[PDB]
Structure 1
Amino acid sequence: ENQNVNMSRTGSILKNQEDTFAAELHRLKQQPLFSLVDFESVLDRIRSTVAEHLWKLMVEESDLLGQLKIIKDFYLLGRGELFQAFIDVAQNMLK
């Protein structure tokens, strides 16, 4: 809701999953009783279709596979030679 409204996880300005959510609301209110299986099997449907759309968000906006090998190369030191020249110079003036 902060940055941009077409970037939503469920599909709220941009998709029609919330009318499926409206159908879920219609299914879950007229029931006078309560149990565990009927409540939690549709806790999948408010999660699983929502848990895939943001996965299909951040692939295209960022090139996911780009920075998430880059940030490991800065910390686990994949570019090994590229920091030793830093280490050689930083030794002579951290004395």
Structure 2
Amino acid sequence: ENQNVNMSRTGSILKNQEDTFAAELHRLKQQPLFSLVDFESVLDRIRSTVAEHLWKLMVEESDLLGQLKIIKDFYLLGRGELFQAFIDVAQNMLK
């Protein structure tokens, strides 16, 4: 809701999953009783279709596979030679 409204997880300005959510609301209110299986099997449907759309968000906006090998190369030191020249110079003036 902060940055941009077409970037939503469920599909709320941009998709029609919330009318499926409206159908879920219609299914879950007229029931006078309560149990565990009927409540939690449709806790999948408010999660699983929502848990895939943001996965299909951040692939295209960022090139996911780009920075998430880059940030490991800075910390686990994949570019090994590229920091030793830093280490050689930083030794002579951290004395």
Deviations 1:33-55 (A, max 9, x none): 00000000000000000000000
Cα distance, 1:86 vs structure 2: 0.0
TM-score w.r.t. the length of structure 1 is 1.00
Q: How far apart, CA to CA, are the structure 2 residues paired with 1:4 and 1:13?
A: 10
* Residue in structure 2 matched with residue 61 of structure 1 by the alignment: 61
Structure 1 runs not aligned, ≥5 long? none
Cα distance, 1:82 vs structure 2: 0.0
Q: How far apart, CA to CA, are the structure 2 residues paired with 1:9 and 1:80?
A: 38
Deviations 1:29-79 (A, max 9, x none): 000000000000000000000000000000000000000000000000000
Cα distance, 1:93 vs structure 2: 0.0
Q: CA RMSD in A?
A: 0.0
Structure 2 runs not aligned, ≥5 long? none
The alignment-based identity, stated in percent, is 100
Secondary structure of 2:65's match? helix
Q: How far apart, CA to CA, are the structure 1 residues paired with 2:76 and 2:6?
A: 36
Cα distance, 1:14 vs structure 2: 0.0
Secondary structure of 1:87's match? helix
Cα distance, 1:11 vs structure 2: 0.0
* Residue in structure 1 matched with residue 43 of structure 2 by the alignment: 43
Question: How many positions carry a matched residue from both structures?
Answer: 95
* Residue in structure 2 matched with residue 86 of structure 1 by the alignment: 86
Q: How far apart, CA to CA, are the structure 1 residues paired with 2:21 and 2:82?
A: 52
Cα distance, 1:10 vs structure 2: 0.0
Secondary structure of 1:51's match? helix
